[PDB]
Amino acid sequence: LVEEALRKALEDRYLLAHEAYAGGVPALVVVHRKEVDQAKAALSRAGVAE
Amino acid sequence: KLEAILSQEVEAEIQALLQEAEAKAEAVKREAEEKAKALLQARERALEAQYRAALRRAESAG
């Protein structure tokens, strides 16, 4: 869900990476500076937060 | 792609800054020409003065 939301919000110039740990995934989204608000807004609409 | 964004945040600053510093390197140099010219404008009047005074003195003296 998170990937979809970010992808529509942030086009294809965002980087979504994840690495496991035994159970879920801690994920990191890497975005350009000044694209911070938009990036955040996308997480907030899914219900995921920082 | 994502690396093409990165080259555009830089490529923008490095023309803003280098356009600004080629107009200070213009500006100092414009004032430097306008000063040397004026320090010789005052030199031009001075010499004249000294010659107009000088000749009048020699006329009176004689």
Confirm if A36 and A46 have CB atoms less than 8 A apart: no
Given resolution (angstroms): 8.7
A39 CB-near residues (< 8 Å, 6+ apart): A6, A9, A10, A14, A29, A31
What are the percentages of helix, strand and coil residues in chain A, rounded to 5?
A: 40, 15, 45
Residue A23 DSSP symbol? S
Q: Which residues of A touch B2 (CB under 8 A)?
A: 13-15
Classify residue A34 as left (phi > 0), alpha (psi -120 to 50) or beta. left
**What is the DSSP code string of B1-62?**
--HHHHHHHHHHHHHHHHHHTTTTTTHHHHHHHHHHHHHHHHHHHHHHHHHHHHHHHHHHH-
Classify residue A23 as left (phi > 0), alpha (psi -120 to 50) or beta. left
Method: cryo-EM
Residue A14 DSSP symbol? -
Per-residue buried b or exposed e for A11-48, using 16+ beta carbons within 10 Å of the residue's own CB = eeebeeeeeeeeeeeeeebebbeeeeeebeebbeeeee
A31 contacts chain B (CB < 8 A): no
Query: Alpha carbon of B9 to those of A23, A37, B2, B14, B57: distances in Å?
Result: 38, 17, 12, 9, 74
User: How close, in Å, is residue B8 to chain A by CA atoms?
Assistant: 11
SS3 A15: strand
User: How close, in Å, is residue A4 to chain B by CA atoms?
Assistant: 18
Which of these, A5, A25, A3, A26, lies nearest to A15 by C-alpha position?
A3
A17 contacts chain B (CB < 8 A): no
d(CA A36, CA A17): 17
A12 → chain B, closest CA residue: B1
Token pair 């390197």 is found at: B25
Confirm if A44 and A29 have CB atoms less than 8 A apart: no
